[PDB]
Design a protein around this ligand. Structure first.
Ligand SMILES: [Ca+2]
Length: 311
């Protein structure tokens, strides 16, 4: 069982033609079993998995594999820690993580974060990001708040308010609260309703297009990402992946975290990617990424269409 999977990992790193077995293993078993296998690797081989991978894999691919063999909640906490520990802040990482997880998952990681690091997740995020930028107000609200159901009347009121905000150039002082309340505190069901209500009321205008009008820079990415996550997580994954493939080269740290966080749940990513961007995901990946790393990203995002195996 586990001993067999360990030997498959060993062989994958010793024969270049078998490197993707590491990815097949990630796709074939639940995260808790992958973590068990990682723990068992050390016991069996006398070498820690990360030390072994380092000898055989490039940094991008090693980092990806390590992210895959972790339980989700652990991965999320480690990403937030990585983005905040020391001198700088990786603001993009904090946005990618906090805005694309369910409210129950935020609750779970607040507690796990404290257990791992003896720090408050909300407090570390606020200390590092401040609360001036709209993207910062948004992730702070998400980090410490809840998403609670609302009635149609409240949605009608907020609809008028968000339209007002969309119509004015720049985020006005009276508009800050509208944007944060909707994007940080709406449930998925209510946000989907509001999205459709906006199109219904404003002659087919788009709420996401209004986000684009209102915001720029990381604010714009953050509110688009929150929009897409609430509306359809598969669209959010496609959006984040498109941005990560962005421009001259590609953002491998971002590619890794978006892929590791979302590949298992967001099976429609490739479909929405083509629907929205016109180009097949695999074709963009082929252009942007060479070698085994590109093959791994393509494979992880290929929908698994069969039951998982067990160790
Ligand atoms: Ca405005």
């Amino acid at each position: 069982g586990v001993t067999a999977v360990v030997q498959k990992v060993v062989e994958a790193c010793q024969d270049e033609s078998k490197r993707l077995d590491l990815i097949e293993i990630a796709r074939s078993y639940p995260p808790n079993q992958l973590r068990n296998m990682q723990r068992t690797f050390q016991a069996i081989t006398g070498t820690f998995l990360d030390a072994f991978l380092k000898k055989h894999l490039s940094k991008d691919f090693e980092s990806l594999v390590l992210m895959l063999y972790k339980p989700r909640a652990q991965l999320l906490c480690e990403l937030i820690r990585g983005a905040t520990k020391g001198a700088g802040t990786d603001e993009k990482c904090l946005v990618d993580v906090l805005l694309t997880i369910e409210t129950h998952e935020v609750r779970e990681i607040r507690q796990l974060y404290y257990q791992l690091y003896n720090d408050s997740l909300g407090d570390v995020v606020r200390k590092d990001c401040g609360d001036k930028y709209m993207w910062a107000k948004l992730i702070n609200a998400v980090a410490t708040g809840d998403r609670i159901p609302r009635d149609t009347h409240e949605l009608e009121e907020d609809l008028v308010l968000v339209r007002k905000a969309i119509e004015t150039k720049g985020v006005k002082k009276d508009e800050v609260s509208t944007w944060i309340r909707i994007f940080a505190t709406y449930t998925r069901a209510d946000f989907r309703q509001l999205h459709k209500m906006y199109s219904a009321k404003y002659n087919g205008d788009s709420l996401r297009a209004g986000v684009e009008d209102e915001f720029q820079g990381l604010d714009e990415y953050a509110f688009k990402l929150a929009h897409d996550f609430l509306y359809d997580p598969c669209c959010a994954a496609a959006f984040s992946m498109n941005v990560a493939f962005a421009g001259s080269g590609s953002d491998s740290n971002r590619l890794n975290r978006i892929t590791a966080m979302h590949f298992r749940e967001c099976k429609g990513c490739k479909y929405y990617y083509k629907k929205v961007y016109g180009q097949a995901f695999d074709e963009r990946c082929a252009t942007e990424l060479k070698g085994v790393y590109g093959d791994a990203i393509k494979l992880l995002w290929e929908p698994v269409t069969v039951p998982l195996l067990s160790m």
